Amino acid sequence: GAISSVLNDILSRLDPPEAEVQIDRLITGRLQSLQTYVTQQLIRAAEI
Amino acid sequence: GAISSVLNDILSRLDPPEAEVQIDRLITGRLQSLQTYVTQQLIRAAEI
Amino acid sequence: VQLVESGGGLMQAGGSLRLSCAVSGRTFSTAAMGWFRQAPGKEREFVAAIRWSGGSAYYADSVKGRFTISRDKAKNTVYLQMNSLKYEDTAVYYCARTEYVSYLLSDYATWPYDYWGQGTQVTVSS
Amino acid sequence: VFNATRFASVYAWNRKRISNCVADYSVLYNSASFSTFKCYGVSPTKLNDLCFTNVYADSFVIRGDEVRQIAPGQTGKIADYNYKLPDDFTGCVIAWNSNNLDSKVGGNYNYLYRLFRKSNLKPFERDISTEIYQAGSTPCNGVEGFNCYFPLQSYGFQPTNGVGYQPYRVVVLSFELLHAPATVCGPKKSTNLVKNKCVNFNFNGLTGTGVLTESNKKFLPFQQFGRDIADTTDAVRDPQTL
Amino acid sequence: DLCFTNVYADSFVIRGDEVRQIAPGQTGKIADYNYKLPDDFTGCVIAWN
Amino acid sequence: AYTNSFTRGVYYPDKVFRSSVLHSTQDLFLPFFSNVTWFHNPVLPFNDGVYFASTEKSNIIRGWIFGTTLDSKTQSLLIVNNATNVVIKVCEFQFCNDPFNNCTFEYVSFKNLREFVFKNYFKIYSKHTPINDLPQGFSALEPLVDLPIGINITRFQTLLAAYYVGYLQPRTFLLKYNENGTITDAVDCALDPLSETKCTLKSFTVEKGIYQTSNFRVQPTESIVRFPNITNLCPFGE
Ligand SMILES: *[C@@H]1O[C@H](CO)[C@@H](O[C@@H]2O[C@H](CO)[C@@H](O)[C@H](O)[C@H]2NC(C)=O)[C@H](O)[C@H]1NC(C)=O
Ligand SMILES: *[C@@H]1O[C@H](CO)[C@@H](O[C@@H]2O[C@H](CO)[C@@H](O)[C@H](O)[C@H]2NC(C)=O)[C@H](O)[C@H]1NC(C)=O
Ligand SMILES: *[C@@H]1O[C@H](CO)[C@@H](O[C@@H]2O[C@H](CO)[C@@H](O)[C@H](O)[C@H]2NC(C)=O)[C@H](O)[C@H]1NC(C)=O
Ligand SMILES: *[C@@H]1O[C@H](CO)[C@@H](O)[C@H](O)[C@H]1NC(C)=O
Ligand SMILES: *[C@@H]1O[C@H](CO)[C@@H](O)[C@H](O)[C@H]1NC(C)=O
Ligand SMILES: *[C@@H]1O[C@H](CO)[C@@H](O)[C@H](O)[C@H]1NC(C)=O
Ligand SMILES: *[C@@H]1O[C@H](CO)[C@@H](O)[C@H](O)[C@H]1NC(C)=O
Ligand SMILES: *[C@@H]1O[C@H](CO)[C@@H](O)[C@H](O)[C@H]1NC(C)=O
């Protein structure tokens, strides 16, 4: 939902007041992705 | 946390800029629901 | 910017005359041209208007089916073809111009115009 | 564009292409001559450090209360029938009062706006047609009358008009954020290049941290820069030497 | 219903259209060179002609 | 006359260098194994983009015209290649009835197989090769010209040897970059089910089995709107 998939690009285009929002969007997405990965890995590790 | 549960209602009542946010809310919720279902099913499958 | 009228004068009833009005000087844009008339002792009265773009025309009831307004954009000239002349058509005829663009053509009947010609006499005889 | 004597009507908004030049944006964002200076998806100060292939300055004039319609995802006569911005617009909108210039005693009617249209405009769409609007079921055939109206109408610009109705000049700067060679950069100066060291590098706005080494990649004459699997930069082409 | 250690009343005068600059995350002559509020400002702004 | 576009019409969609990778991308490409019109004078449409090909022995073909009416009063792109110099201008030219001012831009630069792609401003890719109809095989087109002219084009003509015309479509492709970032093979993700499978897996080699690729879904044919019977009018008559 952010304006870019890159972080430095946002930092080099926007001021903190709005870069914060975009970075919040990116952080939410990436954190969710990491959680998914870790959960799948835990289950697979149980299997192994 | 959106204005409604129906997608078409949001699309037909609000303009895109507002509609997108509400749809983002719905998408987040439904995606989270799917993730929960899949995780529970994985665990249940391990048990089986 | 000047409006220069010509044509008209004396004609017997039932005849036809053509008035011309040439626009000279630098114009940014023209929205519409119009003809008005003033008979002695009477108020000046709308006759006809034409939109510069597209050439749609609007007429006073008193001249419908008798008069035709037309425009030559390249010559920056408006014309009034005055057919089936009646004594009641005797008047000084004035050319008018505006840069005001209304969506509604009928507005040109009552719009105060910005630029006016000197006036040309039309006299209808028996 | 900004010092232009005469502006175009909003329905026939002018477009000026900017390319192959250095853009000192300070002259704009340091000036006090503007009432509205609103940049979406960008901060103007950072534009000094950025390059683009093209910029587009769309110039026109509106009345004050319609300036708000110059923004992404707005509605109204202007944003619908005259000039529509995309919802994902990345660029600046500048607007300043022009009552001293565009208004005169008796009313300036040179500036127009489109009043009717069968559909809303697409972003950056330009409609200059004067077709008679068919409001009803009856064909107009280019003849005005009942349910047949001329689509355009003049602005009433008098110096005594309310600020809401006073003329405002509008300039819209859009940037060509594409992956291709850039000819519109900022005033930021360049430095010497250091190899085989960890450095904070910036190539035409592409910022990053890493070690720059002579590559053996068979880059094509046109290839601007390369990426790896993760959609991240892996090799670049020096802007100053090939 | 609240207490604090301190309150600060910052008083000044501007022109009308610049009142919009007295707010977090705003830009312009006033917000840049005259009086800048923090992005996380917690307090009130009052203005009258 | 028609010919088979076996695997031709592939171009580098962007200036990004990529090596030893299979990249999926959607843009205007020439559908694989499509029908290309065969000519050996007329004006042809420019629906979304054009793939032009020419088998030349004598270099009869020299240029192209693009536009809407291909006449004055309408900005028209004219491309003429004579000897070394290639002249591109977008004035309102007084075009001739049989061809074979306000200039906003101007630039100055069967064995012969010449393949061009023209799309939209304006982008021109091309490739030149020697050959022994349309030759079987695979080759990629290097970007050559980028004209920021913004000319509205919906029709075009050629200015004179055999040639072929095809029309691009917005299709997803899988492209195989080699060690040297050169495109060596491609997959049209909608040509056939096998291609859908290849694109789903991001591979050119499907090992045996059954793969879920897509989702079949009936589209509604028409819209139905039903409301209660109208009555109890507002008293506007009053
Ligand atoms: C370019 O201007 C021409 C002027 O008519 C128009 O082109 C038409 O585009 C429509 C829709 O793409 C086609 O159905 C017609 O066949 C085209 N006409 C011609 C002359 O071939 C159109 O107004 C403009 N095209 C675009 C895409 O903006
Ligand atoms: C092809 O025709 C054009 C028309 O003159 C010639 O192109 C010129 O090339 C010279 C040399 O580079 C340029 O300086 C000019 O700008 C070009 N002229 C224009 C106006 O396009 C070219 O000489 C011709 N080639 C031949 C001799 O076949
Ligand atoms: C990439 O370019 C290199 C450089 O020529 C090619 O590598 C050669 O491969 C051929 C056989 O394919 C060998 O005979 C040469 O010894 C190689 N040259 C060197 C110096 O490495 C290679 O063909 C190109 N990559 C592809 C697959 O097209
Ligand atoms: C107009 O030109 C003057 C002269 O340099 C300059 O000071 C001013 O900023 C320009 N205004 C614009 C950018 O329109
Ligand atoms: C200026 O550009 C030319 C062409 O790329 C190059 O040869 C020269 O080294 C450049 N100068 C600087 C400052 O790098
Ligand atoms: C090419 O056209 C022929 C003649 O209609 C047709 O039979 C064939 O299916 C076409 N092949 C394609 C779609 O490439
Ligand atoms: C060139 O542009 C001018 C300015 O609009 C226009 O008057 C003229 O018709 C154009 N010339 C042609 C042949 O289109
Ligand atoms: C007035 O009565 C006439 C005659 O029946 C009818 O056509 C018209 O619709 C009525 N007006 C309204 C506003 O109902």
mmCIF file of C-alpha atoms in Angstrom, chain A residues 1 25 32 36 39-40 43, chain B residues 24 31-32 35 39 42-43:
data_model
loop_
_atom_site.group_PDB
_atom_site.id
_atom_site.type_symbol
_atom_site.label_atom_id
_atom_site.label_comp_id
_atom_site.label_asym_id
_atom_site.label_seq_id
_atom_site.Cartn_x
_atom_site.Cartn_y
_atom_site.Cartn_z
ATOM 1 C CA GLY A 1 0.000 0.000 0.000
ATOM 2 C CA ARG A 25 3.019 0.278 5.915
ATOM 3 C CA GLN A 32 3.842 -10.132 8.841
ATOM 4 C CA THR A 36 4.565 -16.341 8.431
ATOM 5 C CA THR A 39 5.561 -20.199 11.810
ATOM 6 C CA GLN A 40 5.945 -22.390 8.729
ATOM 7 C CA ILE A 43 5.908 -26.590 11.909
ATOM 8 C CA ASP B 24 -7.557 -2.081 2.877
ATOM 9 C CA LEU B 31 -6.182 -12.111 4.874
ATOM 10 C CA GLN B 32 -5.531 -12.472 8.609
ATOM 11 C CA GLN B 35 -3.784 -17.099 7.645
ATOM 12 C CA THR B 39 -2.198 -22.303 10.405
ATOM 13 C CA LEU B 42 -1.508 -27.223 9.358
ATOM 14 C CA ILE B 43 -1.376 -28.031 13.057
#
